[PDB]
Amino acid sequence: QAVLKFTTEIHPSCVTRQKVIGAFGEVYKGMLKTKEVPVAIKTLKAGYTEKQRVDFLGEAGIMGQFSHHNIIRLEGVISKYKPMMIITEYMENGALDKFLREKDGEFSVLQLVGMLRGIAAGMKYLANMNYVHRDLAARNILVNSNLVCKVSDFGLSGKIPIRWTAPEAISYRKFTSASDVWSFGIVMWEVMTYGERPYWELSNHEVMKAINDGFRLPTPMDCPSAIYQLMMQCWQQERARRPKFADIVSILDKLIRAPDSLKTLADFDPRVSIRLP
Numbered sequence: 001q002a003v004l005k006f007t008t009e010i011h012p013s014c015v016t017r018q019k020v021i022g023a024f025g026e027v028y029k030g031m032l033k034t035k036e037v038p039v040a041i042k043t044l045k046a047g048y049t050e051k052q053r054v055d056f057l058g059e060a061g062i063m064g065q066f067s068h069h070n071i072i073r074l075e076g077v078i079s080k081y082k083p084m085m086i087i088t089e090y091m092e093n094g095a096l097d098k099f100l101r102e103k104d105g106e107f108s109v110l111q112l113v114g115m116l117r118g119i120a121a122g123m124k125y126l127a128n129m130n131y132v133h134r135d136l137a138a139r140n141i142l143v144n145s146n147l148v149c150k151v152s153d154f155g156l157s158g159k160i161p162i163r164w165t166a167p168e169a170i171s172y173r174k175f176t177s178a179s180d181v182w183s184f185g186i187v188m189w190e191v192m193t194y195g196e197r198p199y200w201e202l203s204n205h206e207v208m209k210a211i212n213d214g215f216r217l218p219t220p221m222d223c224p225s226a227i228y229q230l231m232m233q234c235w236q237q238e239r240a241r242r243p244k245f246a247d248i249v250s251i252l253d254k255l256i257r258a259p260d261s262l263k264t265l266a267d268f269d270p271r272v273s274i275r276l277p
């Protein structure tokens with residue numbers, strides 16, 4: 001029970017499950033009695049294995065431990081009754097990838113960079129807490145009604161997220177906070193492009209080959225030079241050369257606080273010629 005030391009135990013009478021939103025069990029949208037609050041509810045259904053129980057309660061325990069503005073907030077856990085449940089806050093705006101694609105061009109550069117600073121602060125916290133995310137991507141980030149981004153982990157889409165993953169993590173399963181930094185660079189590109197697919201139609205093998213050949217994603221349109229410089233350094237082949245999350249947070253904070261620094265734009269390489277008088 002020590003695993004749950006940072007969690008609040010919720011009584012089942014306070015929870016109502018309404019609609020399945022994911023699927024040892026299912027995830028539901030529901031309501032929590034604490035005037036009810038909307039919540040997401042992950043269940044561990046009858047028949048779960050020992051490994052599944054250890055993973056489920058371990059997930060609940062770390063989510064309770066995390067207490068940060070940019071990490072999804074655990075409302076509580078049901079561990080004393082069956083089915084067991086993990087209950088989190090709910091965001092009507094949903095996941096960041098779909099959000100940006102449905103709001104193309106609607107935000108200022110400063111708003112976009114602010115979302116990256118928040119994601120970076122959440123990741124710095126996770127790394128400092130010695131938690132390696134392994135699946136950092138815009139699809140795993142929730143957006144609240146204040147445009148605050150909350151790092152989450154919804155599990156795999158299981159689709160292996162090759163184009164978000166650092167080379168050493170793909171090649172030999174070395175997942176660390178430095179491979180999370182690589183993923184963060186990809187998230188920066190996702191944000192600045194309003195959710196474009198990294199590497200467009202390239203297949204997974206083509207992406208890995210391009211990376212090994214030295215190619216990197218080109219600059220997004222209208223992107224601050226400093227922001228593209230930062231994402232590029234997240235994609236250094238040599239793990240030890242990448243910035244740490246503390247460096248990323250510091251840089252993003254300083255750019256936002258001296259906002260003229262974001263007015264210098266990186267050149268964009270057009271794919272298409274339009275000749276006009």
Ligand SMILES: Cc1ccc(C(=O)Nc2cccc(C(F)(F)F)c2)cc1Nc1nc(N2CCC[C@H](O)C2)nc(-n2ccnc2)n1
Nearest residue numbers: 021022027040041042086088089090091094151152153154
């Ligand atoms: C119930 C639930 C359980 C666990 C997690 C979760 O993050 N665990 C996690 C594990 C390790 C590390 C971290 C860490 F470090 F990142 F924090 C976080 C999130 C949700 N809650 C949730 N799950 C979904 N799902 C899940 C099924 C697929 C579906 O498409 C979306 N959707 C919403 N949701 C949507 C709109 N508002 C809220 N909430």
